């Protein structure tokens, strides 16, 4: 069967050297001329950078002429001046050339930083520009005489050299000279010699060199470029339509610099093959040909040479090269960003009579949005003759149409974003409902996911358009389907503050009020007992009530009992489904308490319950909120009766250490920080004065004379609740307020003995000053840094998706609790949960298989693990996984914003990457640069050093920048001898024998030893570790799935040790390696298998490798990966999803994953 | 082109030889108009309103 | 070092060049007469290029030509330059018959007469490009005759150029030295049948050309000699003199020009002044070739420093223009109205408008418009000649509006009707045309068109093309 000739749908790409002939190929007609156009009637000239007859018609289906304007015309070539008429269109497609007399260099090949030319030639750089600018004269085919073929002469050298050797020597210089260096080259011979030579010699300083070379070499030969393709013959140029001249208001014209450039390259050409026909002297016509290969270069890429300026304008005019550069990055215009039609913004009010699957759109924001659709429509059902008519209806606002779009508005639903995304759910999907006004009605539980205040905001909406981004939009990006934060499986559509004031505010109790300790039949008439205003809210109270457990099996269990609980928690209680206990109401409900609920709710009785309930909470919490009548005054906020006092006092420890300084007792510095501890203890003092007193200061009477509970003043139940507010901002606003620091950070001894409530002074408020404006630069930093770090791990990361099933292995890590020098902080539970057993636990006796091999271990399995004593589980890591070129869902986790496994073909990289970034804000070595130390893999500044092997050790030598430690193994050789510097306090003791990993010195540790002298899980763990110690400080939850993902990017590469298939050193992929040996160790030789090492590669590093080069193109150095690309002749499969995005084709994730995989195996196939 | 002619054929109209460039007020923003200025080349006949 | 910017590595290398004496300039001068003066008269030497000269004239007066594209003149008229041709002709009739010891005296003036020929300068590169092509066509000849006697049949050259020099046309060395019985003798027997067929052009062109081969090599050889020496003296001249050109180029550096663009364009007008120069005349060559340079440089400028190639007089004119507004700007203390400048220039005086509008250079498509941010001005021109969408959907409709609607009426009004118009098919019919492929013809097609439209025209159908309309 015939593959195909004209156009299928293509696969991958390939990127080559242009040949002569290749780029006459794409020509459609040399351009002759400088001119452009006429200047009256504005046609293009011919024939010229804009031209009718090389490149195309000026008007659709018209001939230049105009002898014929009909579209019946089409394939003729005009007899007049040839143009085929034909769609303007192709003025953007069609190409052309330019034959340059004198050969030129291509400046992407001479000044890439490791020259092509010079390399490939085996020649310095300033060798060849020497002779590109005919200042010296190169041998080529030296052949035998005197002299080297490679070698440079000067005039009187090439002279005398000329008059003793005729013929059998040869030398030129120019481009025309390089050009015949290039040409004259045979990669083959130089092949064998090399080999040769490599094989005689033993150094290390000539071997290695030469190996390198010789790949090389073989690298280039397999190609398919040549040498003499560097430099050029023909020269293209770039469509007109694509550089265009087109006119502006005012009768003036605007035009791209690429036809200042093009134009000054034709005109020097041009005027060169007047000068040869002219026959010029040598000094005029060299002259000629350097500011030809001036032009030239800066056409192609301007700035490695003159930097050429813009007619009449000092601005650096725009170049080839500048043109795919673009810039603000790193950014290629698929990466940066693109406008989207189908699309809209505004600023977002409350809405909180929404469910959360909604969201409020505006009448004429969603008429103009779904204009088509409405048009369409209108005509389907008739009520419009024609689109036109359908046009005129919608324009005119005719009163019917609204109904239309109430149609296709219904179950059609848009996509909502917001400024700053960070993580997945930064975009989410509701259902339109029309609203009255401009502004966008956002729902108040997601007002947490997308970072939203309502102090201003926009928000930007987007409508799906086509069937499967409908269905997209409803399955995937739904509000409801995501309740979870990917980061950790606790629910994201917690309540915010209002609501959870409410609830709070419900559920708590007082000691006495109306209707204590009376007995009600349940729920209803506790909510009917109050509501008319004879049992106060909270008031302890028996009342019946009947639970619900599903604890049989798939099967609910009704139970009911005299519950001792509050009137508040009773009217709750019929908001709480089914199988929940009536425990879950009955304490306070703080802010942790109504989250775990919400948690408990959907690990029981699944989604559409937990949604449900979530929507109840959220009214219940803002109307009983409401009721609560909660306000905040000046007397709401208590300054301690005793803070004068503790003042007092504590000024007077300052006069004492004062006194003692006068009278020399204690030093200058000593002192300060005397004073410093005092003040210091002194803001604890009022502080955990105005807490007690603001805290529990309700003293109130029940029946007999007196008792005591917690307060319920205003500003207290908000910072308790977790509404809003906390210990620290309420003890600003009531006792003393900190000790500032100059901008030194020298921290001032005269801390602010006043607060909020009372005024502060000019001093005070100017010493503030500084802490202020230093948090707001530090924030506004921060977040840059943020976004620098998702990117880098994103760039790390990214194509690593959901692949396989099971790769089925025994492998992972060891899961303990962290037990950290305290108590347990963090359980072994969180560490173990939504993850995989390694393999089958025992209880304590055994032959006894609680949890058998592989079970994903959800909350029952955990909670039976917990009942046991089990102190450790073996858990399958994304590090450890046997599968190559991804992750199986078997071994990664079940973690999603779904409480199930994870499925084929999400992308688990990009969610790891967004997971870990979007909390990079809160972060305060330490802090977030020690998060990018840690991911960079960095060495620390001072480190200690591990024994490089066990084994009894000792000192030798001496003083000589190092004092040499010289390790002593058992039954081994000795020969490991390493220096360290003596001038370092060791720890590792002279007469003991240490273990390898042990300290042999105190200090951090780099990352690269704890994977050599370790191990892989040593590493990981560690890395892990420390960045959990890093966010866990900061009160962030990050599941260690994510982490254990970028470390396993981390570590991609090996570099090989042992032999029988590939070369020495290299570093190089493990999936490949792996691959390759477990392909080796059957069949091939019987075993040949090569040994390699791990290598922890950092991710700006990582990032680097990419065997895709239009993903590399992206973020890295663009001129240089196109160049790089070339000369091997790169030929670039996509695969990723950078390539793809860039492409504009399908994701190979997602929704993709069926096609690309469908088409992947189609591809090296029958 | 086609139908479109045949159209003008039909319903015989004089389609104008002029666009119209007016200036209208914005989409969705309205208010009252409260002064008018008329600039003129210096040489060019002045119009009726202005 | 060099630090390239080839304004560099060109002063430098010029500026070895030493400064001419005033006497070593009438040395090249003089050198350049001796080398120019030897092609002429190498061309004067040549029978063809009398005979051909003559059949050329010979073409003026029958009408096939004119005098401008043969002569440039002679020192000297078309009566005169008739009788002078007569002349020219006269000596070449006579020394055609002379032919016969004595003709020698005659032939030396029957170059004079034709070196008094002032030749259109396409005429002379004719004639001697001719010349060198004859003597590649006697290379064929002798290159062939010499390889297929040395690497075809094995002889030595050595013995080969003996019997050859002054002769090489008849058989007194090819029928009568391959009986010497040399090693290489015999031998030339196997390719005799490929040597004596290509002598017979070889003899053929002492015919045409009237010269011996002997000749035929020494002539142009002479030619290309005083070529060389020409060539090489006027070269010498220009490297000599470029300093002037460099010196010149800088008074018109931001006129919208390259330095080295400046300097190379100078360049080459100094190539043309050393080429037409004449140091007889005792003008010096520093002030004559100075307004050759300036010339180089002001009409190349003109020309290719615009984006827009605007015509020389056109360029003058705005310059003018410029002008008179340095006169009056204070004048007027402000500035001169659009319309005054009018009346200052000599044409029509609306055309100020038109021609200070053309005038104008284009923005660069880069221009950074605000915030220095990556919006450029290319950046928010939007495409006026794209159709919009919403149309193109109500094109695709008037397409199934219409073909309902002939759908609707009779097939053969409905095929009238799509003739009469380009509806579906290529171009559209002039009536006469829907007569003949209906053979009903005439003034009756015209009567169903009508009443065709008439029947579309009120509705149930009207209606919904009425919608159409805008
Ligand atoms: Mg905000
Ligand atoms: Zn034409
Ligand atoms: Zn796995």
């Known amino acids: 069967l015939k593959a195909q000739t004209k156009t299928e749908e293509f696969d991958a790409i390939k990127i080559a050297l242009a040949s002569p002939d290749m780029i006459r190929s794409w020509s459609f007609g040399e351009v002759k001329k400088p001119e452009t156009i006429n200047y009256r009637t504005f046609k293009p000239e011919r024939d010229g950078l804009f031209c009718a007859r090389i490149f195309g018609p000026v008007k659709d289906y018209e001939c230049l002429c105009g002898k014929y304007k009909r579209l019946k015309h089409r394939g003729v070539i005009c007899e007049k001046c040839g143009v085929e008429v034909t769609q303007t269109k192709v003025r953007r497609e069609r190409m052309g050339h330019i034959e340059l007399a004198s050969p030129t260099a291509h400046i992407w090949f001479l000044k890439s930083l490791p020259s092509r030319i010079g390399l490939l030639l085996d020649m310095p750089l300033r060798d060849i520009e020497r002779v590109l600018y005919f200042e010296s004269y190169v041998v080529i085919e030296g052949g035998m005489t005197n002299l080297e073929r490679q070698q440079i002469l000067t005039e009187e050298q090439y002279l005398d050299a000329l008059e003793e050797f005729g013929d059998e020597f040869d030398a030129k210089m120019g481009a025309e000279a390089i050009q015949a260096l290039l040409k004259s080259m045979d990669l083959e011979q130089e092949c064998e010699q090399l080999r040769e030579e490599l094989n005689e010699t033993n150094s290390e300083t000539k071997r290695k060199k030469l190996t390198k070379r010789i790949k090389l070499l073989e690298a280039f030969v397999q190609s398919g470029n040549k040498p003499e393709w560097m430099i050029l013959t023909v020269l293209p140029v770039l469509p007109p339509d694509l550089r265009p001249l087109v006119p502006l208001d005012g009768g003036r014209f605007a035009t791209s610099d690429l036809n200042d450039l093009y134009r000054r390259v034709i005109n020097r050409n041009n005027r060169l093959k007047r000068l040869l026909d002219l026959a010029a002297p040598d000094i005029i016509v060299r002259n000629e040909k350097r500011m030809l290969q001036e032009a030239v270069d800066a056409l192609l890429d301007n700035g490695r040479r003159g930097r050429a300026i813009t007619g009449s304008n000092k601005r650096p005019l725009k170049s080839l090269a500048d043109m795919i550069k673009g810039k603000q990055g790193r950014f290629r215009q698929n990466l940066l960003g693109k406008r989207v039609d189908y699309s809209g913004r505004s600023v977002i009010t409350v809405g909180p009579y929404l469910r959360l699957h909604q969201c409020g759109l505006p009448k004429k924001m969603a008429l103009e949005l779904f204009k088509p659709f409405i048009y369409g429509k209108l005509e389907l059902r008739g009520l419009a003759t024609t689109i036109k008519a359908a046009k005129k209806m919608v324009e005119r606002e005719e009163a019917v149409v609204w109904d239309i779009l109430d149609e296709v508005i219904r179950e059609h639903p848009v996509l909502l974003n917001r400024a700053p995304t960070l993580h997945r759910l930064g975009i989410q999907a509701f259902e339109p409902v029309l609203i009255e006004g401009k502004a966008i009605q956002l729902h108040p539980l997601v007002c947490a996911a997308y970072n939203a205040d309502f102090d201003g905001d926009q928000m930007a909406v987007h409508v799906p358009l086509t069937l499967e981004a409908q269905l997209e939009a409803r399955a995937l990006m739904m509000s409801t389907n995501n309740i979870l934060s990917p980061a950790n499986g606790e629910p994201i559509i917690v309540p915010s503050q209002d609501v959870v004031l409410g609830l709070y505010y419900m559920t708590r109790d007082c000691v006495n009020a109306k209707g204590e300790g009376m007995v009600l039949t349940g729920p209803k008439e506790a909510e009917r007992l109050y509501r008319s205003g004879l049992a106060s809210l909270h008031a302890r109270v028996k009342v019946r009530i009947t639970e619900y457990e599903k604890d049989a099996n798939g099967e609910l269990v009704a139970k009911t009992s005299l519950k001792d609980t509050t009137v508040g928690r009773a009217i709750l209680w019929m908001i709480v489904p089914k199988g929940l206990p009536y425990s879950i109401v009955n304490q306070a409900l703080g802010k942790k308490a109504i989250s775990k609920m919400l948690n408990t709710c959907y690990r029981i009785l699944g989604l559409k319950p937990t949604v449900i309930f979530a929507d109840q909470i959220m009214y219940t919490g803002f109307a009983y909120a409401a009721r609560s009548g909660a306000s905040v005054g000046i007397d709401d906020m208590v300054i301690p009766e005793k803070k004068h006092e503790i003042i007092s006092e504590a000024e007077a420890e300052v006069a004492e250490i004062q006194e003692q300084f006068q009278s020399g007792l204690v030093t200058a510095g000593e002192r300060y920080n005397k004073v410093i501890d005092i003040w210091a203890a002194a803001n604890d003092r009022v502080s955990k004065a105005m807490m007690d007193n603001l805290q529990t200061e309700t003293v109130i009477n029940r029946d007999g004379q007196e008792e005591k509970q917690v307060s319920f003043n205003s500003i207290y139940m908000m910072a308790d609740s977790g509404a809003r507010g906390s210990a620290a901002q309420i003890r600003q606003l009531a006792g003393m307020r900190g000790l500032m620091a100059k901008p030194d950070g020298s921290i001032i001894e005269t801390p602010i003995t006043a607060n909020f409530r009372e005024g502060l002074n000019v001093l005070q408020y100017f010493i503030s000053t500084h802490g202020a404006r230093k948090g707001l630069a530090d924030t506004a930093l921060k977040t840059a840094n943020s976004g620098y770090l998702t990117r880098r791990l994103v760039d790390v990361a990214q194509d690593l998706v959901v692949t396989e099933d099971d790769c089925g292995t025994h492998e992972g890590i060891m899961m303990t609790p962290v037990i950290e020098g305290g108590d347990v902080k963090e359980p072994l539970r969180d560490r173990v949960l939504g993850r995989v057993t390694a393999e089958d636990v025992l209880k304590p006796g055994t032959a006894d298989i609680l949890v058998p091999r592989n079970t994903l271990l959800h909350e029952q399995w955990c909670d039976l693990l917990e009942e046991n004593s089990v102190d450790a589980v073996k858990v399958r890591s994304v590090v450890s996984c046997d599968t190559d070129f991804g992750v199986c869902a078997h071994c990664y986790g079940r973690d999603l914003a779904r409480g199930h496994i994870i499925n084929k073909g999400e992308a688990i990289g990009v969610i790891a990457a967004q997971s870990i970034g979007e909390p990079g804000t809160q972060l305060t070595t330490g802090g977030l640069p020690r998060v990018a130390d840690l991911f960079e893999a960095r060495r620390p500044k001072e480190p200690a050093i591990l024994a490089e092997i066990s084994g009894i050790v000792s000192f030798g030598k001496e003083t000589k920048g190092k004092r040499r430690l010289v390790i002593t193994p058992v039954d081994g050789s000795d020969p490991y001898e390493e220096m360290i510097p003596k001038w370092r306090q060791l720890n590792v003791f002279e007469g003991e024998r240490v273990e390898r990993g042990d300290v042999i010195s105190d200090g951090p540790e780099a990352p690269h030893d704890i994977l050599r002298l370790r191990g892989v899980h040593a590493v990981t763990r560690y890395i892990v570790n420390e960045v959990q110690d890093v966010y866990r400080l900061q009160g962030v939850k990050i599941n260690d799935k994510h982490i254990e993902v970028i470390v396993r990017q981390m570590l991609r590469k090996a570099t090989i040790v042992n032999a029988g298939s590939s070369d020495f050193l290299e570093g190089e992929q493990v999936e490949y390696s792996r691959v390759k040996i477990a392909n080796r160790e059957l069949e091939a030789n019987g075993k040949v298998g090569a040994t390699y090492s791990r290598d922890l590669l950092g991710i700006t590093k990582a990032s680097l490798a990419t065997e895709s080069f239009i993903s590399a193109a992206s973020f890295q150095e663009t001129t240089r990966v196109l160049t790089e690309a070339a000369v091997a002749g790169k030929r670039d499969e996509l695969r990723g999803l950078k390539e793809n995005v860039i492409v504009g084709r399908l994701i190979p994730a997602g929704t993709g994953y069926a096609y690309h995989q469908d088409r992947m195996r189609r591809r090296a196939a029958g | 082109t086609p139908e479109e002619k045949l159209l003008r054929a039909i319903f015989g109209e004089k389609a104008s030889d002029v666009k119209d460039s007016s200036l209208r007020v914005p989409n969705g923003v309205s208010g009252t108009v409260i002064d008018v200025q008329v600039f003129t080349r210096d040489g060019v006949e002045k119009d009726k309103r202005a | ?470």
């Open chain 3, 1 to 470: 070092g060099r630090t390239t910017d080839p304004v560099r590595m060109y002063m430098r290398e010029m500026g070895t060049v030493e400064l001419l004496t005033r006497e070593g300039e009438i040395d090249i001068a003089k050198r350049i007469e001796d080398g120019i003066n030897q092609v002429q008269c190498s061309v004067a030497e040549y029978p063809e290029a009398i005979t051909y000269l003559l059949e050329q004239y010979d073409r003026v007066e029958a009408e096939e030509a004119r005098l401008s594209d043969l002569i440039t003149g002679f020192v000297d008229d078309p009566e005169l330059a008739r009788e002078k041709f007569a002349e020219l002709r006269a000596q070449y009739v006579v020394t055609r018959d002379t032919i016969k010891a004595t003709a020698q005296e005659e032939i030396l003036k029957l170059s004079e007469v034709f070196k008094q020929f002032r030749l259109v300068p396409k005429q002379f590169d004719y004639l001697v490009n001719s010349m060198r092509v004859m003597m590649d066509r006697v290379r064929t000849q002798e290159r062939l005759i010499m390889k297929l006697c040395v690497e075809q049949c094995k002889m030595p050259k050595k013995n080969f150029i003996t019997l050859f020099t002054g002769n090489e046309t008849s058989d007194t060395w090819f029928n009568a030295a391959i009986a010497m019985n040399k090693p290489w003798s015999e031998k030339l027997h196997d390719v005799s049948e490929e040597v004596h067929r290509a002598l017979q052009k070889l003899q053929q062109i002492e015919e045409e050309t009237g010269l011996t081969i002997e000749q035929v090599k020494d002539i142009n050889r002479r030619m290309s000699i005083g070529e060389a020496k020409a060539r090489r003296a006027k070269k010498e001249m220009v490297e000599a003199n470029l300093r002037l050109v460099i010196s010149i180029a800088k008074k018109y550096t931001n006129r919208g020009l390259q330095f080295l663009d400046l300097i190379q364009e100078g360049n080459i007008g100094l190539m043309k002044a050393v080429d037409k120069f004449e140091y007889r005349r005792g003008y010096k060559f520093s002030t004559y070739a100075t307004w050759w340079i300036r010339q180089a440089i002001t009409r190349s400028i003109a020309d290719q420093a615009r984006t827009i190639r605007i015509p020389v007089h056109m360029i003058e004119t705005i310059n003018k223009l410029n002008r008179i507004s340095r006169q009056m700007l204070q004048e007027m203390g402000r500035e001169p109205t659009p319309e005054e400048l009018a009346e200052r220039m000599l044409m029509p005086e609306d055309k100020i408008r038109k021609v200070l509008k053309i005038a104008k250079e284009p923005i660069s498509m880069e221009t950074p418009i605000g915030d220095d941010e990556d919006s450029h001005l290319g950046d928010f021109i939007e495409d006026t000649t794209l159709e919009l969408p919403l149309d193109s959907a109500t094109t695709e409709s008037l397409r199934a509006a219409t073909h309902d609607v002939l759908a609707g009426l009779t097939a053969r009004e409905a095929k009238v009707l799509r003739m009469r118009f380009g509806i579906d098919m290529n171009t559209d019919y002039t009536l006469e045309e829907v007569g003949k492929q209906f053979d009903v013809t005439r003034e009756r097609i015209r009567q169903i068109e009508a009443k065709a439209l008439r029947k579309l025209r009120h509705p149930s159908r009207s209606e919904v093309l009425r919608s159409f309309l805008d």
